[PDB]
Amino acid sequence: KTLEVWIMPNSPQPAEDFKALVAPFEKAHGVEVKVTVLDWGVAWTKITTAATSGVGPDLTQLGTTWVGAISAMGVLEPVDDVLEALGGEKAYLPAVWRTTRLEGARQATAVPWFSELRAFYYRTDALKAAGVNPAEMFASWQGFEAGLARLKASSFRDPETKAPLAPLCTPGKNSWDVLHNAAPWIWGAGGEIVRQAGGRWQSALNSPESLEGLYFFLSLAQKGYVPAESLEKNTAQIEADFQAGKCAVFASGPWMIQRAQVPEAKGGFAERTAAKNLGVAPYPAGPKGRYTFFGGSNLALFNFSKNKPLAKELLKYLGGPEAQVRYAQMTGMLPALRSAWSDPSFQQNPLLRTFIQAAQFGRTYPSLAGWGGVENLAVQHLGMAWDLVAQGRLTREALKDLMDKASAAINQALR
Amino acid sequence: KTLEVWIMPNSPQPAEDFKALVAPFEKAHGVEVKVTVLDWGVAWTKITTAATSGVGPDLTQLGTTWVGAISAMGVLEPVDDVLEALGGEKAYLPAVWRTTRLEGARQATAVPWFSELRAFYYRTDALKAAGVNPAEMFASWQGFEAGLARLKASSFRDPETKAPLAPLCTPGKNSWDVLHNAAPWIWGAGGEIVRQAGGRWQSALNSPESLEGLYFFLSLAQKGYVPAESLEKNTAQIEADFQAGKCAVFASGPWMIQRAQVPEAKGGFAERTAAKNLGVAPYPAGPKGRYTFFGGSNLALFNFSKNKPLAKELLKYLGGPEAQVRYAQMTGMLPALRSAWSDPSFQQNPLLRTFIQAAQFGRTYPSLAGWGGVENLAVQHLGMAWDLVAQGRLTREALKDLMDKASAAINQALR
Ligand SMILES: OC[C@@H](O)[C@@H](O)CO
Ligand SMILES: OC[C@@H](O)[C@@H](O)CO
Ligand SMILES: [Cl-]
Ligand SMILES: [Cl-]
Ligand SMILES: [Cl-]
Ligand SMILES: [Cl-]
Ligand SMILES: [Cl-]
Ligand SMILES: [Cl-]
Numbered sequence: 027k028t029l030e031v032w033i034m035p036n037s038p039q040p041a042e043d044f045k046a047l048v049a050p051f052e053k054a055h056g057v058e059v060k061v062t063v064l065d066w067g068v069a070w071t072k073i074t075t076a077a078t079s080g081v082g083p084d085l086t087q088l089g090t091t092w093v094g095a096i097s098a099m100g101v102l103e104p105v106d107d108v109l110e111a112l113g114g115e116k117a118y119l120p121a122v123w124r125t126t127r128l129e130g131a132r133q134a135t136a137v138p139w140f141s142e143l144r145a146f147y148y149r150t151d152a153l154k155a156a157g158v159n160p161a162e163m164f165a166s167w168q169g170f171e172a173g174l175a176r177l178k179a180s181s182f183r184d185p186e187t188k189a190p191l192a193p194l195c196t197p198g199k200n201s202w203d204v205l206h207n208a209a210p211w212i213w214g215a216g217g218e219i220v221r222q223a224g225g226r227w228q229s230a231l232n233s234p235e236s237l238e239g240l241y242f243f244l245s246l247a248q249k250g251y252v253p254a255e256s257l258e259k260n261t262a263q264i265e266a267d268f269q270a271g272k273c274a275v276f277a278s279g280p281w282m283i284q285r286a287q288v289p290e291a292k293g294g295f296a297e298r299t300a301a302k303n304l305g306v307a308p309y310p311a312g313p314k315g316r317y318t319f320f321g322g323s324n325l326a327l328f329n330f331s332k333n334k335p336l337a338k339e340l341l342k343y344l345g346g347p348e349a350q351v352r353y354a355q356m357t358g359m360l361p362a363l364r365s366a367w368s369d370p371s372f373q374q375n376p377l378l379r380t381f382i383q384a385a386q387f388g389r390t391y392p393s394l395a396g397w398g399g400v401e402n403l404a405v406q407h408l409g410m411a412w413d414l415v416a417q418g419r420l421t422r423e424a425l426k427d428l429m430d431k432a433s434a435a436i437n438q439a440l441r
Numbered sequence: 442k443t444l445e446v447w448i449m450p451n452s453p454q455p456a457e458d459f460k461a462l463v464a465p466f467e468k469a470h471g472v473e474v475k476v477t478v479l480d481w482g483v484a485w486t487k488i489t490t491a492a493t494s495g496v497g498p499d500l501t502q503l504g505t506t507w508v509g510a511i512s513a514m515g516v517l518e519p520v521d522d523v524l525e526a527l528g529g530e531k532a533y534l535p536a537v538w539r540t541t542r543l544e545g546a547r548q549a550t551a552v553p554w555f556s557e558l559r560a561f562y563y564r565t566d567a568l569k570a571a572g573v574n575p576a577e578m579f580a581s582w583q584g585f586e587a588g589l590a591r592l593k594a595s596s597f598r599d600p601e602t603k604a605p606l607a608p609l610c611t612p613g614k615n616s617w618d619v620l621h622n623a624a625p626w627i628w629g630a631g632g633e634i635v636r637q638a639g640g641r642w643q644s645a646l647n648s649p650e651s652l653e654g655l656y657f658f659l660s661l662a663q664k665g666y667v668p669a670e671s672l673e674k675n676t677a678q679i680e681a682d683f684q685a686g687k688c689a690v691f692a693s694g695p696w697m698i699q700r701a702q703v704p705e706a707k708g709g710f711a712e713r714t715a716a717k718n719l720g721v722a723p724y725p726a727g728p729k730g731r732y733t734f735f736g737g738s739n740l741a742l743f744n745f746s747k748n749k750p751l752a753k754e755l756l757k758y759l760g761g762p763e764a765q766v767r768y769a770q771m772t773g774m775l776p777a778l779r780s781a782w783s784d785p786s787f788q789q790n791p792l793l794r795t796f797i798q799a800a801q802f803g804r805t806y807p808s809l810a811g812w813g814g815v816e817n818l819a820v821q822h823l824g825m826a827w828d829l830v831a832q833g834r835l836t837r838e839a840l841k842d843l844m845d846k847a848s849a850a851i852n853q854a855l856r
């Protein structure tokens with residue numbers, strides 16, 4: 027008769043939106059779904075209290091990077107049955123399928139719900155005035171840096187601010203997504219954060235490939251293509267700066283396309299110049315590959331649930347095509363289920379089509395039980411590198427020393 | 442020499458504000474203080490990674506309810522010496538002094554930084570139009586409810602919305618602060634969330650007095666005083682609703698006073714009717730006492746720091762009068778150090794003086810190592826009570842059964 031589901035604040039009216047999403051299921055099954063919205067400030071510790079105590083909801087949202095840890099606690103019900111009903115492994119991008127279980131595991135313990143991915147938004151008016159061909163700028167790392175250098179030299183002023191635009195706005199260390207902002211560059215240089223090599227998971231942040239990609243990215247800020255002020259800010263603050271006409275290029279997710287249609291009094295930017303001058307391109311091809319950061323959230327069923335068959339029906343509903351389209355639109359995310367990408371709500375919008383192009387390059391972190399420790403240690407040492415950038419002190423050798431320290435700490439944490 | 446400090450996003454420009462705060466210390470000591478801003482989305486797990494790895498800053502911010510858990514890990518340096526230098530135990534409210542150590546511990550492991558406390562904001566225009574005397578409304582629980590009854594009956598319309606105001610806005614279960622919103626009512630009825638007997642803490646949420654206070658509070662929502670919409674929302678959303686003229690009364694912290702002085706175009710609400718009609722009163726006296734929720738943040742020194750003497754000088758500076766006044770203003774919080782309350786920046790503002798009145802009633806949770814699990818389990822079951830409120834189905838008997846379930850789970854966690 028009732029299911030309890032915990033979600034995070036994924037949409038503008040989290041509880042109301044989720045209740046609208048599930049109303050057809052409630053009517054069809056004659057059950058009530060009770061949703062509780064967990065601040066990302068408290069979600070993780072509420073979810074581990076549920077895991078340790080055996081007292082919790084039926085379903086919980088998990089960040090994709092949380093799946094290995096909570097799975098490793100032995101508290102999640104297998105959901106291979108749900109995933110088979112939805113079309114099995116080949117219904118998902120490989121990157122997304124990796125997030126359905128603890129890394130390496132035979133059985134699924136999480137159902138893909140929606141995907142976060144990042145692509146570059148750009149000011150089409152700024153690139154035109156700089157003489158920057160958007161295709162060349164996003165076809166190679168040399169192209170990207172050459173585009174930022176032309177944007178730096180440009181006399182273009184934003185029509186509202188009457189000031190130059192920064193070529194690239196990115197956070198540095200003061201954001202939740204420090205590693206995610208770096209990951210595409212690591213990967214595109216042929217690197218990785220961790221590798222399963224020489225008979226164990228170990229850091230690869232100090233590999234020559236990883237170092238090349240990290241140095242490429244962080245050196246763009248040292249060369250003057252990123253404002254000093256951006257390095258103090260988080261991702262949300264950078265979004266606001268791009269809305270406000272301060273930034274020619276920045277990475278973000280699909281939600282900005284919706285925000286460009288929403289009035290400022292409702293937290294969008296439809297009244298600003300940027301809303302009418304918006305382009306999107308995937309991350310540029312690196313020397314050793316081309317990768318798009320994927321994250322987002324999955325759903326899991328606690329093994330202590332008293333309602334497992336009904337909760338599995340609700341996972342099949344939430345994971346299936348109609349609800350995938352609807353909730354991706356409510357959240358400004360991309361559906362997890364690839365069949366949902368053909369919906370006209372995506373295909374009729376050229377900017378969302380470019381996000382689907384970006385999705386083809388998708389890559390996630392390994393689903394390690396100890397992922398949060400790896401990421402935390404990687405980000406402490408990436409922040410030390412961003413501190414050198416902020417002072418104009420980043421060199422290849424100083425970066426190598428920081429990633430050797432990171433690698434020692436990560437490798438201890440993985441033992 | 443550099444010192445490293447981790448903070449959370451306490452002020453509108455977190456990094457730049459903190460750098461401004463410490464610039465005098467840096468000049469005095471010829472040292473650079475490097476700050477990293479951690480989203481409350483990730484600060485806890487970053488601090489436990491630091492604790493387990495030895496890789497971390499010199500100083501970290503901690504929420505007050507985090508002190509027991511991090512102290513129990515054995516990673517914090519004793520700071521009795523810093524606290525004596527700031528005036529010792531009697532420099533602080535007793536509630537704030539409780540947060541300097543793990544409950545029952547001999548040595549202090551945290552230095553009070555700033556205090557979060559809640560009082561009731563009210564629309565002076567709405568109460569006048571409803572014929573409600575603010576002093577009588579906030580002198581007793583029966584006065585409080587009588588005032589809400591007059592506010593429900595009132596034909597007053599907000600001049601901008603041209604709609605009635607809700608008598609009382611409060612979150613229900615979809616907020617980070619579910620227990621904190623309930624705590625003053627539990628305590629004012631003579632109750633508590635936990636009680637020590639023997640060497641054992643146990644739940645007191647099913648105590649007669651706790652039940653009386655929780656039913657009083659939750660039943661105001663079942664009586665029509667609180668909009669259904671409020672019960673879907675978090676504290677920030679409710680703050681926005683009060684700014685937008687939807688709420689006659691709501692509880693929050695001192696930051697709203699600054700927000701009322703700031704234009705909307707800069708993130709405040711100075712253009713709105715509520716900014717021009719703002720009153721503040723402490724929580725009303727209960728039948729068995731009068732208490733104000735305190736939280737906030739402290740600072741701690743990791744025992745693996747290689748700069749403990751200099752870091753303790755920085756704790757003395759951040760803990761001391763000039764920085765206490767400056768930071769409490771940046772954050773919109775109350776200073777932890779009582780001597781700072783005499784500053785003109787507080788005393789020249791009648792609403793901040795009312796917050797200082799409210800502080801005399803301050804109360805905190807016990808500083809238990811397992812606090813987060815207690816609170817998490819308590820909140821799971823209070824959320825089930827909020828769901829009965831939303832249906833008009835909360836009875837004293839139903840609340841008792843829910844709090845007995847909460848108590849069983851809590852008592853298991855504390856064994
Ligand atoms: O026409 C835009 C289209 O080429 C792609 O973005 C879809 O893949
Ligand atoms: O004038 C207001 C003053 O009474 C107090 O708020 C100080 O305590
Ligand atoms: Cl398995
Ligand atoms: Cl990786
Ligand atoms: Cl992948
Ligand atoms: Cl800094
Ligand atoms: Cl001690
Ligand atoms: Cl208590």
Ligand SMILES: [Cl-]
Nearest residue numbers: 536539804805
């Ligand atoms: Cl206390």
Ligand SMILES: [Cl-]
Nearest residue numbers: 836837838839
């Ligand atoms: Cl009853």
